[PDB]
């Protein structure tokens, strides 16, 4: 019979959570959650705008300057919450606000 793949192509956003009010690197946990929710509802209704929105709104400059693209993600490379939220997606589909050790993430599977 058929068999499923060990990897898939993806895009993502990082929203940094900080415990300090004075740090410019990220936001307070309620402001990070609000930012993550308002970009989620904007990238989920149009995943072709994901690359324009991630490049402005993501704090991970290592992927945001590449339009939020990760390329092919292998199992075990990312957080267990990130992997669970990615591997359930169809081609071109968008996840949700995913919480991890850095704060909040938003994830898209690619075509």
From Swiss-Prot:
Residues 6-111 form the PpiC domain. It is found in: Cell membrane. Disulfide bonds: none annotated. Residues 25-64 are annotated as: Disordered. It comes from the Bacteria. Plays a major role in protein secretion by helping the post-translocational extracellular folding of several secreted proteins. Belongs to the PrsA family. This is Foldase protein PrsA. It comes from Staphylococcus aureus (strain Mu50 / ATCC 700699). The gene is prsA. The chain holds residues 140 to 245 of 320 of the full protein.
